[PDB]
Design a binder for this molecule. Structure first.
Ligand code: FMN
Ligand code: SF4
Ligand code: SF4
Ligand code: SF4
Ligand code: SF4
Ligand code: FES
Ligand code: FES
Ligand code: ZN
Lengths: 114, 430, 142, 49, 235, 99, 162, 60, 108
């Protein structure tokens, strides 16, 4: 369903800007640009997904090595303007925060199979 | 010397005579024992005569290679192209089972110096370096005193020993590394760099110390050469079997009633050596798990093979082992073979210089796997994996330390797979 | 074979090269590409990685192409199964202590190690032990 | 323009095209594509799959 | 159970850092000149290891950064070469060292005859452990590989770093049972000089073996007993 | 399973064929359910199939294979092939040309 | 350099058996049906050089390489940023076609294609790569030669000293 | 799985080990109709049939 | 000031005085901090979260880091050198940002 960037339990984002999800995206819906953070971490300065270009294949969730990007269980995300459907890093992180427990339970169940 | 049976070397046939240090090891005793006797004549006879006499003697190289000494010495260039020739004596004796070279350095210093003179004349080497282990401080002091004495009486230097030949000898010492015993790594260490072996397709005879033709030979070969030229090549050839003629210094260590260093003709039975000179295995011959014949590099042999095995190069090759150095190590039934071979694997992990990928990584891998097997943590398939890794290392390294790391583990797998399986299963069972 | 040029056989095909070339140089002249990590055209030959191993009929054991001088009438085999197995083993030894830092490595799309792992390596590992760890030090602003 | 779009994508990136070629029967449509890639790749499918 | 040096990079310490100054004393400098004379003038870097050993003996057993830089200046080489060689070899100690450096061989031939129990007795009596200097600073414990003393397998080696170049000795104590090792170390604490070589026997004669905590004296067949053959020449 | 056949060719005959095809597919499903094997569901080769997640997180070679399969993808040998399947609407085939 | 000995054999054979009929330069461009201002764009025919990060020779013009390596590329045009989302916006229809799909084995093939469509082209030959080691380090033996510091002077010998 | 501790891709590499051989065919040499119709049945009893392949190739 | 300052790294997973790898994003807008470029609010940043977590003492010279507690539900396994590490200057996991330090090298 709706995409969501995830955080570690400490509150640090899981994303390490490998940029594999952008390379595997069949529709080219993900644009990523990154930098070195002041502490020294490899972190993204931009992570936006076009939900009017997404095909919800789930390939990006497959390619991510740290489980940073997941397709959440939410299918109620219609909008009244197309601009609200161009997600960005802050919106994706907020969506990950809102659905954290459900996503974690689904991932714990799914880990057994794969 | 009889073709049927070999053993029981007599005192009259022993080259190394103050090996036990009952007499003065310095120049006064050395002259009275037959050292520096008629070196003028032997050296004056020419390099060609010495080379042919060494070739006829059949002297193979002590130190592990076993390569014929005369042919190696004959590979040295005959005429200078502007580059001097060097003789380097490998007195670095790092090997986990070998103690034999230290007695020669400390109790027969002058035989080694006379041999250096003879061999340098045989190879046309202006200068010579005696590499000694850094740990052997006192042995080095003895050798240095011998060199100074030989210089004082004119045995060395210009017009050495009265013959129209010129030879200068130096004593150099390392800082501790098993790899520095290898021919190229020793040359690199003496040049002043890290003791990392050089790829062999350039050979030391072509380019060696300071880019000049060099030959690296063990202390024992250099020491035995002068008396071979004095006593005679036929006398040297008589003792051993075909292709394996001379006497060799056997250092018996481990679980034996008396650990001894002794000189014996090659092709003695291992049982005969252990029972006569070492006093027998602690607890009798019945109390044998295994015997490492040629120091730790070569694969071990089980008791059954030790029954009929003969102390020779080619025969130990037939028994899937080798007489690298006459460093025979005896293990009791009480001994845990797994732990000793794991300690040898740790030795090789510690002594790798790290230059090439296969040794640097696979030797540590081997140590880790052996450590897990010492406790039974591993699975049964881990043994087959261990054999595969040993095959991966062998042949793909710059020098032979990868091979020397692979071999003991392969011997353990080949002859004592039952005990490893027992340990792995029992730990799971209990 | 005019004067300095000799003839060498690489995988059963005749190549004319100067005398001063090595085995790797003739293999490049033959169109065969040998896996390399430490050999560089403008740097001194090292021979440490041992990934260039090929087979010479004369030699008993595989030799390093970068540092082996080529000889007249030498036959060079770069596709023998022993060479394939040696390549895979060397690749395993290279990867056992390598950190699992591919996503965070800035060499991710341009790594020789990854590409030669895919081409000349096995797809799976048997290493379960602890890997080596190094502490980095500053070499400057760049 | 599906056929020309396939030319700009990798083989695994082009599988979702076949699902959307026929919205009634998706599995059969992607199946032929994966079979052709398997034939060219000489890949053997396990029996459970 | 790591040895003295755990770092292959320079660890800044109040004793060891850049400002520290090391130079050879005049007599040690004469020894330096004699050491260099053995190697060709153009290939002067051949003396790096003997010079580093001499500087180690002078500096009390530690090869400091100033020592390496001084040796590199004298040999006219980039300092990285001296760093590499000082790091490669084992005898070169790059950390602070005690008055005595006691080394126990743990390789296989020593481990069969009981090197483990020797080390256990030594670490109990000294009370620190391998790689750790005594709290007094009198002994630094170390494990080294084969020392060339396999026939006299249970053995230790001690280095006298107190007096300096004039009074430095690297001696071997062999055929030793744990109680003998403890006795040798107590003698070393007093300053009394113990018996060089094997305690029970002179050298690698056929005299007996160390079994457990006791020496079992067995003497059977001897070879070099009698009159030595002497000079001979082929005719 | 048995092929359903009619002869007239009219609309009714094709409707009857499609119903019988549904029944034959039910039979095939029952056989699939009863004979479903156990083991791998994807090819063991990891140079054409992605590694498992624990495996990529524990092995260097598997992380390399995962990275190069999710960025570059596998390389298909030069060749051409036409593979057809019995789709519900008929025969669906792909003519794939690889360089 | 020997032979691929695969489908490329039949590929090359189909090439040599068949041929194309000659037409005047630019005539096919009218048949193509694309905007005629496309052919006003200028063409650069080049082979990419090797990336400095990697040591593989596949991408280069080397006997190892069996793939087409000569690209037709068009000149770069204006690019801007989307005011709303900062995406890179463009109006160039031919932005990625030449890099992505226009690959040719030989320079003459790309020149023929350009002349057939009417594109003006400039061919840039790659800088030649010769695998010749320098004389100082021509071989592994040269690393440990006397060239480093000269032949060892023997004036340090005790006989020569005294 | 026997691939856990035994890794050898070159033995299990079928993708890169395919090749194409070359032949030349000429009209002068007659076709062998004996091969085509000599093995053909002349009576119902002699009919031989090729069974449908049950499974596609798998590595096991 | 930030307009003419050299981009620098605080040094938690880097060194105190190094250059920071920077793209040109936000250069026109005038933002020169990593978090400013992507967060427009005044809330707590994830870097503020990771700084609040304290370094953890471990035994040995190497620690295995899986990011999360379960190995297959977090970052790839990583082996971090604990040599020359203390509470004030801890080692860092590059994937997770967790900080570790050990006293074993000091022979303890
Ligand atoms: C790793 C390694 C260590 C070696 N250590 C020694 C050694 O300590 N003493 C020795 O005489 N030979 C040692 N050798 C063998 C050397 O090749 C030696 O210099 C040479 O074989 C002497 O030749 P020789 O048999 O004619 O005397 C070692 C070889 C290797 C590969
Ligand atoms: S689900 Fe597929 S299309 Fe959507 S963002 Fe992820 S990879 Fe791209
Ligand atoms: S979401 Fe995952 S795949 Fe995408 S850039 Fe971040 S870590 Fe990489
Ligand atoms: S085999 Fe080991 S010791 Fe020999 S060169 Fe290679 S890494 Fe060094
Ligand atoms: S990209 Fe290459 S160098 Fe970096 S971690 Fe991966 S394999 Fe190692
Ligand atoms: S390229 Fe490394 S050994 Fe030749
Ligand atoms: S094994 Fe200890 S001195 Fe030889
Ligand atoms: Zn972590």
């Amino acid at each position: 369903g709706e995409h969501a960037l995830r955080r570690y339990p400490t509150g640090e984002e899981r994303c390490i800007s490998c940029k594999l999800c952008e390379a595997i995206c069949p529709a080219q819906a993900i644009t990523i640009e990154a930098e070195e953070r002041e502490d020294g971490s490899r972190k993204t300065t931009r992570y936006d997904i076009d939900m009017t270009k997404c095909i919800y294949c789930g390939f990006c969730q497959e390619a991510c090595p740290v489980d940073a990007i997941v397709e959440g269980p939410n299918f109620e995300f219609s909008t009244e303007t197309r601009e609200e459907l161009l997600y960005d890093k802050q919106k994706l992180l907020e969506n990950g925060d809102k659905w954290e427990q459900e996503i974690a339970a689904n991932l714990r169940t799914e880990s057994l199979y794969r | 010397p009889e073709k049927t049976t070999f053993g029981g070397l007599r005192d009259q046939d022993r080259i190394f005579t103050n090996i036990y240090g009952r007499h003065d090891p310095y120049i006064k005793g050395a002259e009275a024992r037959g050292d520096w006797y008629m070196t003028k004549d032997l050296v004056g006879k020419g390099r060609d005569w010495i080379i042919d006499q060494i070739k006829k003697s059949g002297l193979r190289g002590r130190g592990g290679a076993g390569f014929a000494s005369g042919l190696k010495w004959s590979f040295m260039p005959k005429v200078s192209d502007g580059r001097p020739s060097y003789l380097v004596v490998n007195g670095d004796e790092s090997e986990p089972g070998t103690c034999k070279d230290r007695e020669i350095m400390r109790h027969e210093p002058h035989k080694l110096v006379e041999g250096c003179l003879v061999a340098g004349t045989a190879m046309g080497a202006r200068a010579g370096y005696i590499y000694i282990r850094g740990e052997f401080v006192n042995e080095r002091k003895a050798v240095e005193r011998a060199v100074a004495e030989a210089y004082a009486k004119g045995y060395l230097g210009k017009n050495a020993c009265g013959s129209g030949v010129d030879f200068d000898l130096f004593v150099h010492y390392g800082a501790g590394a098993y790899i520095c015993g290898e021919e190229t790594a020793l040359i690199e260490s003496l040049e002043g760099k890290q003791g990392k072996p050089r790829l062999k397709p350039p050979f030391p005879a072509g380019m060696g110390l300071y880019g000049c033709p060099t030959t690296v030979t063990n202390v024992e070969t250099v020491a035995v050469s002068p008396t071979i030229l004095r006593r005679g090549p036929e006398w040297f050839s008589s003792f051993g079997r075909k292709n394996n003629a001379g006497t060799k210094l056997f250092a018996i260590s481990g679980h034996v009633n008396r650990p001894v260093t002794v000189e014996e003709e090659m092709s003695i039975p291992l049982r005969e050596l252990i029972e006569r000179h070492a006093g027998g295995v602690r607890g009798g011959w019945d109390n044998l798990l295994a015997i490492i014949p040629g120091g730790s590099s070569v694969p071990l042999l089980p008791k059954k093979m030790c029954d009929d095995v003969i102390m020779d190069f080619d025969a130990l090759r037939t028994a899937q082992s080798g007489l690298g150095t006459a460093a025979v190590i005896v293990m009791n039934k009480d001994t845990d073979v797994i732990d000793a071979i794991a300690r040898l694997s740790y030795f090789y992990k510690h002594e790798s210089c790290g230059q090439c990928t296969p040794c640097r990584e696979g030797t540590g891998w081997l140590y880790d796997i052996m450590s897990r097997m010492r406790k039974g943590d591993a699975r049964l398939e881990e043994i087959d994996m261990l054999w595969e890794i040993t095959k991966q290392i062998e042949g793909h390294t710059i020098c032979a330390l990868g091979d020397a790391a692979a071999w003991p583990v392969q011997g353990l797998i080949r002859h004592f797979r039952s005990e490893m399986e027992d340990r792995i299963k029992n730990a799971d069972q209990q | 074979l005019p004067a300095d040029k000799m003839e060498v056989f690489v995988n059963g095909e005749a190549v004319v090269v100067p005398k001063n070339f090595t085995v790797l140089q003739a293999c490049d002249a033959a169109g065969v590409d040998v896996p390399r990590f430490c050999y560089h055209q403008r740097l001194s030959i090292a021979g440490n990685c041992r990934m260039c191993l090929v087979e010479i009929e004369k030699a008993p054991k595989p030799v390093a192409s970068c540092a082996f001088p080529a000889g007249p009438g030498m036959k060079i085999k770069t596709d023998t199964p022993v060479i394939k197995k040696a390549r895979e083993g060397v690749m395993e030894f290279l990867l056992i202590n390598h950190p699992l830092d591919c996503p965070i490595c800035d060499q991710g799309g341009e790594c020789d190690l990854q590409d030669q792992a895919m081409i000349f390596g096995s797809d799976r590992s048997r290493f379960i032990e602890y890997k080596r760890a190094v502490a980095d030090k500053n070499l400057g602003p760049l | 323009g599906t056929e020309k779009l396939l030319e700009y994508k990798t083989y695994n990136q082009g599988i979702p095209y076949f699902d959307r070629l026929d919205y009634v029967s998706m599995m059969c449509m992607e199946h032929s594509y994966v079979l052709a890639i398997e034939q060219l790749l000489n890949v053997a499918v396990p029996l459970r799959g | 159970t790591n040895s003295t040096d755990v770092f292959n990079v320079h660890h800044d310490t109040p004793e060891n850092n850049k400002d520290t100054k090391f130079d050879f004393t005049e007599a040690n400098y004469k020894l330096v000149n004699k050491i260099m004379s053995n190697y060709p003038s153009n290939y002067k870097a051949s003396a790096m290891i003997p010079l580093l050993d001499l500087a180690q003996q002078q500096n009390g057993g530690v090869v400091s950064l100033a020592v390496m830089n001084r040796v590199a200046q004298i040999l006219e080489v980039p300092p990285i070469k001296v760093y590499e060689v000082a790091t490669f070899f084992t005898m070169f100690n790059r950390s602070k060292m005690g008055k005595y450096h006691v080394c126990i061989c743990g390789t296989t031939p020593c481990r069969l005859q009981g090197a483990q129990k020797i080390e256990e007795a030594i670490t109990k009596h000294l009370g620190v452990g391998i790689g750790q200097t005594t709290a007094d600073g009198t002994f630094t414990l170390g494990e080294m590989e084969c020392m060339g003393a396999c026939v006299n397998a249970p053995m230790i080696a001690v280095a006298d770093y107190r007096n300096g170049v004039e009074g430095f000795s690297y001696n071997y104590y062999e055929d030793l049972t744990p109680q003998d090792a403890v006795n040798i170390l107590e003698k070393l604490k007093k300053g009394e000089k113990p018996k060089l070589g094997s305690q029970h026997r002179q050298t690698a004669e056929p005299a007996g073996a160390v079994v457990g905590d006791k020496w079992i004296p067995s003497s059977g067949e001897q070879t070099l007993m009698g009159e030595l053959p002497g000079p001979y020449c082929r005719d | 399973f048995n092929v359903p056949i009619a002869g007239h060719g009219d609309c009714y005959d094709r409707y009857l064929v499609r119903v019988q095809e549904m029944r034959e597919s039910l039979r095939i499903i029952y056989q699939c359910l009863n004979e479903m094997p156990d083991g791998l569901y994807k090819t063991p080769d990891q140079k054409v199939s992605p590694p498992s997640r624990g495996q990529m997180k524990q092995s260097m070679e598997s992380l390399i294979h995962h990275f190069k399969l999710f960025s570059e993808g596998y390389h298909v040998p030069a060749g051409e092939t036409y593979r057809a399947v019995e789709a519900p609407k008929g025969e669906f085939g792909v003519y794939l040309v690889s360089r | 350099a020997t032979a691929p000995q695969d489908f490329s054999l039949a590929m090359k054979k189909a090439d040599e058996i068949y041929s194309g009929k000659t037409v005047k330069a630019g005539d096919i461009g009218f048949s193509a049906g694309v905007p005629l201002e496309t052919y006003n764009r200028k063409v650069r025919i080049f082979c990419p050089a090797k990336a400095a990060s990697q040591s593989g020779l596949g991408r280069t013009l080397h006997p190892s390489s069996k793939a087409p390596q000569w690209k037709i590329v068009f000149e770069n045009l204006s690019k801007w940023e989307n005011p709303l989302m900062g995406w890179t916006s463009t109006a160039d229809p031919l932005e990625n076609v030449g890099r992505s799909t226009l690959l040719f084995y030989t320079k003459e093939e790309a020149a023929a294609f350009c002349a057939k469509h009417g594109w003006e082209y400039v061919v840039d030959e790659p800088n030649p790569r010769k695998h010749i080691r320098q004389k100082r380090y021509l071989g592994y033996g040269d690393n440990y030669s006397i060239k480093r510091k000269g032949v060892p002077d023997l004036a340090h010998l005790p006989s020569n000293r005294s | 799985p026997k691939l856990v501790y035994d890794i050898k891709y070159f033995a299990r590499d079928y993708r890169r080990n395919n090749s194409y051989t070359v032949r030349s065919v000429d009209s002068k040499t007659p076709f062998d109709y004996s091969k085509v119709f000599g093995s053909a049945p002349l009576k119902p009893a002699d009919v031989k049939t090729v069974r449908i392949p049950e499974v596609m190739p798998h590595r096991g | 000031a930030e307009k003419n300052k050299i981009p620098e790294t605080v040094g938690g997973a880097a060194f105190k005085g190094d250059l920071r790898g920077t793209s040109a994003v936000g250069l026109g807008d005038g933002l020169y901090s990593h978090t400013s470029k992507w967060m427009q609010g005044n809330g707590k940043s994830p870097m503020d979260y990771i700084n609040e977590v304290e370094p953890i003492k471990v035994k040995g010279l190497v620690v295995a880091s899986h990011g999360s507690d379960d190995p297959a539900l977090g970052c790839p396994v990583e082996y971090i050198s604990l040599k020359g590490t203390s509470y004030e200057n801890p080692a860092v996991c590059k994937y997770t940002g967790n900080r570790y330090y050990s006293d074993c090298w000091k022979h303890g």
